[PDB]
Amino acid sequence: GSHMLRDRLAGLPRAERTAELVRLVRTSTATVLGHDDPKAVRATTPFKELGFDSLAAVRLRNLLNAATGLRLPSTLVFDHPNASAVAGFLDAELG
Numbered sequence: 001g002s003h004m005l006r007d008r009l010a011g012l013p014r015a016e017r018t019a020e021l022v023r024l025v026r027t028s029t030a031t032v033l034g035h036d037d038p039k040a041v042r043a044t045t046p047f048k049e050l051g052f053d054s055l056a057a058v059r060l061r062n063l064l065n066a067a068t069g070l071r072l073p074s075t076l077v078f079d080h081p082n083a084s085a086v087a088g089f090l091d092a093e094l095g
Contacts, residue, residue: 043084
């Protein structure tokens with residue numbers, strides 16, 4: 001942010017949003033497994049490994065919803081190879 005810092009700051013553009021949702025996704029996801037430790041979680045981490053199939057995959061979308069507010073896809077956990085991606089899908093779903 002330059003010049004229009006204030007705006008940017010109190011504007012949180014897509015960037016911040018994407019980077020924002022991401023952080024959330026990470027936790028949100030990890031939260032599914034049953035832990036609140038993102039440190040042990042990356043953005044390029046495969047959900048599968050995280051431990052997602054259906055139940056956990058469901059909880060995600062559910063929580064993810066709170067990240068967006070729409071009826072996110074249930075196959076996201078599948079269409080999404082990693083969190084980094086999840087962010088996009090959400091972003092694309094938001095815009």
